[PDB]
Amino acid sequence: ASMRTLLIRYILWRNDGDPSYYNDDFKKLILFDELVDDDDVCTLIKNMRMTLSDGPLLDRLNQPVNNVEDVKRMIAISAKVARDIGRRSEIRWEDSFTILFRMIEKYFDDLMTDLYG
Amino acid sequence: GASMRTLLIRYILWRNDGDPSYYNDDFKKLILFDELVDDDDVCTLIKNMRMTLSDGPLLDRLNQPVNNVEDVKRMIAISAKVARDIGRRSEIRWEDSFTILFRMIEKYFDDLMTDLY
C-alpha cells in the first residue's frame, strides 16, 4: 500500500525528470535498471510511436510474472519506458498502473523484504 | 495536459499519506479548490466508505457528471479531502479512482490549466 504509492511516484518521476519530485525512496528502485536490456526498451518506444499509444507497454505488462525477479524487471521496463517516451506523452498512466498492480500485487510482501528486510 | 494528470495523481497521493518529503508548492493552487466542497459531504462519504468497507461510494461520487471547470475543481477537491480523511492505512486501489476522475475531467484539462496559470 506504501508499495503502490511509491511505484506510482517513481514511474511519474522517471517520466517528467522534475528534480523537485525526486525522493531517496527511489534509489533502491533505480537499481532494478540492470535487469532490463536498453534494446527491449528502444523497440517498445518505437512500437508505441508507430501505434501512437501505450498499447505495446500494456502488452509487455500483461506478460506473466512468476517470482520477485520478474516483478523487478516489470517495474524497471515501466520506469525506462516512462523516461524514454518523454514528459509530453499524453499516456493514461492509470491504465499501466492497473495492469502493473494486477500482476505484481501478490509479490508486494516478497518485494518489501528484498528492499528493507 | 500530461502535466495535469501527473500533478493531480501526486497531489491526491500526498493528501492521502501526508508525507512532507512529497510536498510540493505546485499543490498550493489545488488546495484552494477545498472551498468548493462542504466538509459534511466529505464526512458522509467517509462514513459510507467505512460502513461498506469499500471505495464504492467514492467511485459513485466520481461518476456524477461534469459540465464545466467548476465541477472539475469540486471533483478534484472531494477526491483530495477523501484521500486525507480516509487515512494512509486504507487499502484503496487509487488507479481505480484516477481512471474515473480522468474519464470525467480530461476534456477540461486545457480550461483548468488556464484557470491555474
UniProtKB/Swiss-Prot annotation, chain B:
GO terms for biological process: symbiont-mediated perturbation of host apoptosis; symbiont-mediated perturbation of host defense response; symbiont-mediated suppression of host NF-kappaB cascade. Pfam families: Poxv_Bcl-2-like. Gene3D superfamilies: dsDNA poxvirus. InterPro entries: Orthopox_N1 (IPR009353), Poxvirus_Bcl-2-like (IPR022819), Poxvirus_sf (IPR043018). Keywords: Early protein, Host-virus interaction, Inhibition of host NF-kappa-B by virus, Modulation of host cell apoptosis by virus, Viral immunoevasion. Induction: Expressed in the early phase of the viral replicative cycle. Belongs to the poxviridae OPG035 family. Bcl-2-like protein which contributes to virulence by preventing host NF-kappa-B activation in response to pro-inflammatory stimuli such as TNF-alpha or IL1B. This is Protein OPG035.
